[PDB]
Amino acid sequence: RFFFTSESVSGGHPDKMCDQISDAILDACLAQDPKSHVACETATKTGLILVLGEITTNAVIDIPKIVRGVVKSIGYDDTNKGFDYQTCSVLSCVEQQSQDIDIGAGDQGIMFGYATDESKEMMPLTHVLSTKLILRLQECREKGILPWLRPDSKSQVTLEYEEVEGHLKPIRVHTIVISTQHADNVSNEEIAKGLEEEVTQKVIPKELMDDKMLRYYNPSGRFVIGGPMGDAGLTGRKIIVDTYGGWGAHGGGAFSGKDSSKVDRSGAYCARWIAKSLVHAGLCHRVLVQLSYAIGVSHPLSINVNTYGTGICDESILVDIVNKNFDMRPGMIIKELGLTRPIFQKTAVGGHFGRNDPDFKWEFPKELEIPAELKPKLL
């Protein structure tokens, strides 16, 4: 029995605003040219958005217009809100190419896949809640359920656990944090009310909820003026909220703004896929698959499956099962997971994993050919 903490941030967060914008460009490209190559990043500050990077593509794209559209969508239409899509400046330092006239990996790296049967989404509950908490603030903001709300927001769900010999059963949410931006025309008392009633309660399960849970509502006091004004923001800086909330591991690879040819993304996705499959097939309760690649080398340089002593068969075997049933060549990962599609913008917020959108072909498990010795496997 122990406690754990995870966090998440809203799409109004400058760091995440970048992630979004970057993947907006990518989508824009794949839309016209699926074979596009996009390795681009966004940086934003006081009154500015600077898009910088490289893109090989045939697609005729209007970058500044895409950018602005994303900022608008996020809700930044007023300078008093801290950002204005209509009046802000957009510097493009992207070097575009025409390219006009299987697949060794494009870069070397390390990538991680994680999965836990503690939740339906095969994700750490601690992370799920944290992010759901945030998606709800969006709903509230957009739908008018809480009109005083503003885009730049942040959350944190630390919760209690227990481990039944490797199986994680969560008990209760020990403490809770949420720091949102807001209009000046709202009472501190009025905020707490709305936050508890219309977000916390409506997202946190009653089973885990208590009279006994701690509450931290804008403990920094007030938060009217925010957004990218004052703070600086960059692509791929929220790498952990993008993934597993620090539960598994990370390879260091920022996902957003990178096309699927980048092993950093593909490998990370395929890794999730494997893991999600491995726990589905009842081979284990908890897994952490690690993949690794060499620049210019098509096949994976190394492979590791770390089940937390939970997995019934054993790791020498698992590592094999994976290899037999999965083609981990970047080129094929793209094909199998349909990563040439324009689905990546929506990936940029509320986490890349745990979401069962149809286009997220890595969240639907595979069916794995198993040696007959382990035909008795699990629930």
Next chain:
Amino acid sequence: RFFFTSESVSGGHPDKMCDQISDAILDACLAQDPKSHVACETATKTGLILVLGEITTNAVIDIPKIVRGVVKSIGYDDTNKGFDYQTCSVLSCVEQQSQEEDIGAGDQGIMFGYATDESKEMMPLTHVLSTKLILRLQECREKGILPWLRPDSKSQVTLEYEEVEGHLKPIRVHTIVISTQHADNVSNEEIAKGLEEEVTQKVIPKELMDDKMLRYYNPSGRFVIGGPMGDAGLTGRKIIVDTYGGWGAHGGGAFSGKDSSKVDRSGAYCARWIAKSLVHAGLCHRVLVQLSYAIGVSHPLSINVNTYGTGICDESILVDIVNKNFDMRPGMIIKELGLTRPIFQKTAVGGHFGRNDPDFKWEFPKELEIPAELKPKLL
């Protein structure tokens, strides 16, 4: 028995070049004004360095000159090398200002501490080697031991392991990767020779070395023109090479460019400290400590110590020990670890942890009060 892989990159790597530059500014500030507040980031691309962020300080600083000095130091003096400190452009978008130990943590977040007695440095061997491999390429480049060498370089050490009931004993280096930039006046064959003879051999222990060890020397073929030219680079994008090579966990917090008031750094450091202490004291073989904080709240919001079943004491008994002996208030963490001191530039390369520089006050363990009930623990 199993395999694992970790990676590292050189200070010539654009992503890391930023990390360095950012921390160069920080140092520059703390030099004159220790009470300085710096939340600043760097971005670079083809011919350009863009410094953006915010910093409250009394220090009179020459940012462009600092920047250039860092680029020069790294070795980028020629456009043919891919970057020129003398000729490149420097855009400053930093907003400069003029401007107790119970201070509330100036942000919310999650932070991780890791330690393993598998090595003298209390670090994952896989990571140690990977980074040592890189530091040696520097030595060679700078000292002229391999003059054809160039700054932009990358490494990857995947190695074989065994676990003796929680204790990690490494067996052999299964495979090795190293992709360096170089002058066009080199023979592909000549590179492999020098790489094996003057780096690999002189860093990798003979005990772990063998004839069946795999070697990947610039498998991307050639690599003459590189650096920030072609690639884009940002601060805090190499968060994993900066820490534990994906062995433990991460909170998502980019270290570089942030002053020590930022919990993302302090908490991460203090966490390492705890861990390093916890296995000094023979309480365990392997630990991962997780800290967590709330914005505006001085005390840590939550705490967790995950020893990998290697801990003699049993789990909750020591979460206590930590609390008793450590003051995890950000304000104190600065004082105790002497984080007001301009030591942060050198932190920006070759990893923040595992290095026993005197100024790294978090690498020298603490001495902890222990209930006498625990007289039997570890060597």
Next chain:
Amino acid sequence: RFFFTSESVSGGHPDKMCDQISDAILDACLAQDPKSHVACETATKTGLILVLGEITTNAVIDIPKIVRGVVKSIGYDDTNKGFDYQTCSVLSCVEQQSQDEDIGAGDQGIMFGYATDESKEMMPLTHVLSTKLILRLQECREKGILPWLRPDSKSQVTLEYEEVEGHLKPIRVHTIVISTQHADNVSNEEIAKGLEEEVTQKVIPKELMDDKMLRYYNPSGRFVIGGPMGDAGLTGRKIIVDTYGGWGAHGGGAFSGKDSSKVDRSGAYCARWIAKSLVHAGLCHRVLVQLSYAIGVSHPLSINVNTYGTGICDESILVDIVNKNFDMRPGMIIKELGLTRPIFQKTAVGGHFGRNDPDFKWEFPKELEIPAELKPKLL
């Protein structure tokens, strides 16, 4: 008898906004270090101000804060107005240094001095009115005499003339133009009313005024959302409104953002001085002096005084008188005209010439030694 046209623009005009900002930096520098060297320029667009250039100085300056202060002063405090000093972005790409009489002209060039006794200010009436017209719109805006007014504005005064054997006597204002920005709460009819009554009438002399005089009040229709938003603006792009409204000549030298060591400014100023003196001493009715310099050469490379046949003395004599009484060495020009002073910001709007501010040491004539053969000349 003939007609002529000249124009002017307000300090809200982006092109002029730059000129101002640039000279704001200069002033800021000379304030601390009179021996400062400043060759810097400003560019502005939609949400952005980019300062680029070079400055050798000991002065410790806060450029972004200076910039913002200038924009504020001009009245751009709202995004709806087209610009916001509070929310806009400021990119500094200027390279600052620490500084390590008969002295070399710092650059080669060609410069012009002009003067006409047609007016008290020794300036073309056509230009005087045009600019006065604009200064009045400022007065009205600032003083609240016309609160609906907005900063970005423009004017144009085309005037009828007659020449009495070289002497220009103006007859009447043939046509008039004025295009101002404004709040959207104002009626088209209400604008024309206020413009005629509170500016035109209060600036244009009744002697020159008529019932037949043409009037062009925002003929582009509406003009609510203007400023640097939409329109690109640069330093030294309004070189003619800065000087003589196209009456004399120009050397091409942008004045603003350049310190007084730059012959482009000094020579131009000294030239005005000479001219103003030459017509004061009753040597002529109308003069256009041209100066010319060589890079690294202290003395003027060439000299020319073109009186429009209005000069009693004959030209060969004049250019002598000039030489005898004036020290046209850049080094001296600075000393004599007190150009080490922070007076240059206010020079950046409403024209560099014709204004009898005490600090404008080039508007107060000299007393010249004249051959006794021609004590009979003009009033």
Next chain:
Amino acid sequence: RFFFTSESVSGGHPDKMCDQISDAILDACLAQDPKSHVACETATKTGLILVLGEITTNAVIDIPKIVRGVVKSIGYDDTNKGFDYQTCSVLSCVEQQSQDEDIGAGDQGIMFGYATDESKEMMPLTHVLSTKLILRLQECREKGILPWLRPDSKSQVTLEYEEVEGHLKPIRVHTIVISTQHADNVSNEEIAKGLEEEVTQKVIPKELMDDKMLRYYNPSGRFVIGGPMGDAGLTGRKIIVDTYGGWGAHGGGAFSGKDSSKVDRSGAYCARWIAKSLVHAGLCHRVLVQLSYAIGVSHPLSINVNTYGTGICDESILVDIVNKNFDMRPGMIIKELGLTRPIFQKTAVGGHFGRNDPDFKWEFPKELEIPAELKPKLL
């Protein structure tokens, strides 16, 4: 009898490099879409080019690639030269838009036309030589006639005059200046030798040449490098070299980067046309025509023809003859002068006037319906 000075600069000059780049974009646009609207500017500093402005067009353009191509063409291969087209950074802040005779002038303004029969090109000899001097340095650089030469260069031709009855007859070149950039592998003595032998002598007529003529060859001493590195450069800053070398007048309107719908260009061109015609028809020896426009008003709001007493009738007639034979509506000017064509890049250097390129439809005069009473005029 008197002296006069004019100047010019090479296409390597940063200020002029911008002018070129800007008009390169324009051409690029008109190429696909003649009805394009382009109001864009370039700014350059160290290893950086910033393109900013607005363009309404259907044309699909690759701005960074065009830019780079222009810089290359100009000769900046080596960061060693002060600029490198291959390695420099390109920031695009241009706001691009799809597109939704007798139209109103787009903007208000003042414009000038000048012509002098002192030379074949109907231009001031002082300016012609100055610029020819520079074109020759190009020839030499490009053709290898002087391989040590480098692109950033500057010239200045001050020459002696006489006017006989309003007719300017030039006598001799009093002094000469030329400051060129160069390779470090060449001597100061060797430089002087070349410029005198292979430029000065091969451009300056021997009739105007002599032994007493002054020579200023890199008086700033050395000039190994240069370019945009260490100088700042902007579009439309060399407005005088672009036109008449300060002989006539200027309206303040920067030509380059503006499409022909901009009266600043059209009016200036049409003005030259008129003047060139007026002196061709033997109506006078020397003319300066001034045009003037109102925003949104199609017809010219004012008109003036200043012949320097060198015209053969009153000046009210001339003003008539102009009106009768020319349609000065911006809309028509475009049609008659074929200003929808991509000819504007080459205009950006060596002056907009005096060059008898076929595409320069404003340099070939018109035939004017003059009265029968004035059938006796001029040679």
